[PDB]
Symmetry: C4
Subunit: 277 residues, 4 copies
Amino acid sequence: AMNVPFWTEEHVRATLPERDAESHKGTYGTALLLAGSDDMPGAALLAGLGAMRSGLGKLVIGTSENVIPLIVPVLPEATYWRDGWKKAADAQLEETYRAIAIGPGLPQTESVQQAVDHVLTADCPVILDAGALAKRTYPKREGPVILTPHPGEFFRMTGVPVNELQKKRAEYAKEWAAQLQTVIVLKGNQTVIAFPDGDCWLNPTGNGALAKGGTGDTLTGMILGMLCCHEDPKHAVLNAVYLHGACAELWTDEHSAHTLLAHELSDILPRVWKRFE
Amino acid sequence: AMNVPFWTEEHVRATLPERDAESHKGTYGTALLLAGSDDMPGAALLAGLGAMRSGLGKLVIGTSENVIPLIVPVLPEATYWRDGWKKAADAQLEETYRAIAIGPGLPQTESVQQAVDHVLTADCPVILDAGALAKRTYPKREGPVILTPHPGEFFRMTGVPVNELQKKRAEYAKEWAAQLQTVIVLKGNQTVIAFPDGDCWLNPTGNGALAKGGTGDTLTGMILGMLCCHEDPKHAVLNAVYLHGACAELWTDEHSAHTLLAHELSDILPRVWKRFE
Amino acid sequence: AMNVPFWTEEHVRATLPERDAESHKGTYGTALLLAGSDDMPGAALLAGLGAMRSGLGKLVIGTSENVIPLIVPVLPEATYWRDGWKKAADAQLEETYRAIAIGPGLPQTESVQQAVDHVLTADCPVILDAGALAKRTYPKREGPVILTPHPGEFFRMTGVPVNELQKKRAEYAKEWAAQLQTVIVLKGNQTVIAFPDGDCWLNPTGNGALAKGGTGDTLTGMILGMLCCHEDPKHAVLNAVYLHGACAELWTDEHSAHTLLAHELSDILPRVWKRFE
Amino acid sequence: AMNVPFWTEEHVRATLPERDAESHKGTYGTALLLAGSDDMPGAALLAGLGAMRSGLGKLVIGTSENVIPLIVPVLPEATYWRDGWKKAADAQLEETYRAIAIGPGLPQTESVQQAVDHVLTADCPVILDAGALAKRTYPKREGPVILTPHPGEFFRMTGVPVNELQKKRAEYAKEWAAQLQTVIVLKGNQTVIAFPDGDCWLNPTGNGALAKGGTGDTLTGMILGMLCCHEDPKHAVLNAVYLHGACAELWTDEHSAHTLLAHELSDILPRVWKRFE
Ligand SMILES: [Mg+2]
Ligand SMILES: [Mg+2]
Ligand SMILES: [Mg+2]
Ligand SMILES: [Mg+2]
């Protein structure tokens, strides 16, 4: 009813970055991923793979010590900050990162919020997902804050019940992005990308193959990596959400939508991204 | 001699569910898999992969603590109930599941039967396989109980010797499904699917590539996932058994039947399922 | 100079077994693999994959406790006898196996020889490889003993120096198979398969892609599995050696011979075996 | 400005080795890889895969004890020297190796330099990378020393700031290869391969897909393996750098350059190498 525009293929093609011959990994930046706990380990692998697939230069995974050995054989290109998400509860980060994500596979605790508060004093874009999503406010800072809730997490954040939210998704997402002064990626069919400056878009890609555990962890990583290779973080978010959906669409050409596993979205992205170049 | 009908391709096509665009993982439900022990760990990975491939929304694996790290790198989309199958011996489940499977890679012990008794107080379909199969009776409850014995396990359950069973497979399977008031999937060439209401079918798919360790663990998971995406649990069982066999048939087109590994059935299912859509 | 015949494609085609529809995993038997130590773990994975790919019904891997978790994610279809190769030093096996292999990734110790002595009291074919190969004699027993030395191991076994061996490979292999009353698979280009009854063949397949660590561990497993699905153990050995080589030849059609990894031979076998059916 | 020639396809084709039918793994030699620490484990897997893909006969990985289990499931063909890189700080090597690499995933410490000093008393080519790169001099010895710095590591080695280095890359690389009497592979677009005898080449292959963590670890392993199968170590270095780049070029034919993971370069090398045969 607000006639929110779709972020279309033309917009993706016009905004995806080049990876020029005169580049080194420093050009594409170091991301930090604060994810994975002994109790929810897989989220770190999913987000890690998403991030490294998505154009960053280096990835540091601040996961629980016992999760590290589960990532290495699948993603030997990542490096680690041992118990990083826990350590971040106690002190500001000393290292400079191009972008930070926090939350996948983390519990919904006060200590995770202390880590969030410390990460927000860095000067870079920050993504909050999953256990890092809470009812709270955000400090004025350098760099966007990007929240990636599903409708239940949106309810947790705002008190808008899911059954009311789903009637006016873009209207609520826009209202709350403005109130919180954060980007809100409100997941679902026609995911809403609402910006604090009032810009808002709908995502046209994806299908029900995505309605399964782990696909949002993969998306968080994709956003994290795209923030490292796009100069404009708005375009990084929009392109990540778009390409994530497009990977599910490629899957369903020859595979049943009931059968996708989230990690495969990362495996598909190389060929899908090429098509938009 | 009872002229039991085959569950044919036409029946599969008519009964497989859609995965609509307006869906979220909640629509497709959360399964619980109680499987894998330090001594038989692989069954949990096989059943877990089968289940997540088969249309569920979320999977919780209640496996032994030491088995968790063996699953994560292969199936990072699963989450865990640490020592769940052991914990279930002591108390009713507090969480609501769309469907439950118990037994793959579990020992044939009294404690496993205590877990079975507790799981049966939930209101959902329950599958019993492998170490959860015993000579016993079943309480009247909400939701079907689905037993998946090979002939040796059927003997354990009923006292019908294997050499007598194999002469009259459907007759015995039907008699015992009625007596126990459980679904019985009696494995073998022309697997029998006998329902407590007296309906009975034969499975027409599969071949000797399936006669190797682990393929039944994969089937248990497939049934578990299909119970989450079919409204009619009878159709979930029949389609799982059918599609499982059809994956072996696709394998033998270009691969020797001596060489299949069970996990590959899960890897094949995406393309096989698409063909029946 | 002895004009030893090649075991040709025609012989392979004529002797490979069917996997009929009326089969269960019991038909194809349970193999035991005693392999892998904390210090040489990979051999157990290589031999395990080879064996399960090669037509057995079930595989029990008696490996060191710390090696088990390294196998599971890659070969979840195997089951385990925890510290089996060590336990076998102390007592006769209580379980019946269709075939047994011992040695890959095991140290060349007296305790490994005690395990060999205990395994030889079983009534089944037994393969000795790697650390199980020693200068020794063999008891009269039911079932063939199959030794799989490379030339250096042959020297260890017999005192024939490698430089003399390599001049008269089939003559030495035949002489020693007769003296020991064991099958000897003497590895190398034109691997020699010498039988204690004086039959002897050369293998015509393979290439230098096989001249890299691990390819013999894969072969041991292939022999183990083929012993489970062939009625004639002589044919199992000959076909395993043949098909192993044929997998390397398929690799070199589109890949450099310098670049093969042994586990890939197992991955290739499904398609190669189909061609000989 | 020095008109440094490219090491071209013609030069690669003319210098790559055969793998003849009359070969055994001994012909192709045993490499030692001293890499991977609890804090940087992935480098050992990347370099290990690179090395085993690159024509060696055997690989021993002297990595930290806790890293071993992370390598095995992916590279079961490798064997181990438990805590080898640490042990090498204390004593000369007792075993003979065809080639040695040290440094990927190792900290920049004095103990790593003690290991380097001990490895240099062996008579074989030695590669120093990553944490093994330091400001130092090198003893006259049998066998080349090959340093593989990125520009920041070159600065660490020489005191030439990166912004000055990048203006005159070949001039600085040549000057320092001569001064140190080491081979210097100075990474970047148009990687420089400078020899202590004053020969110098530019690498013409590669693209920005390589500007991501781990691709240099993969290169170190590729050089290590190629040193084992080339008689001329100069040609081994040049061909490794060339083929490494060529793998990235093959990737970008159908995949976005933003999306490559380093381990995939190893997976691509089999087909790329075949093309140059
Ligand atoms: Mg989520
Ligand atoms: Mg079973
Ligand atoms: Mg051997
Ligand atoms: Mg480096």
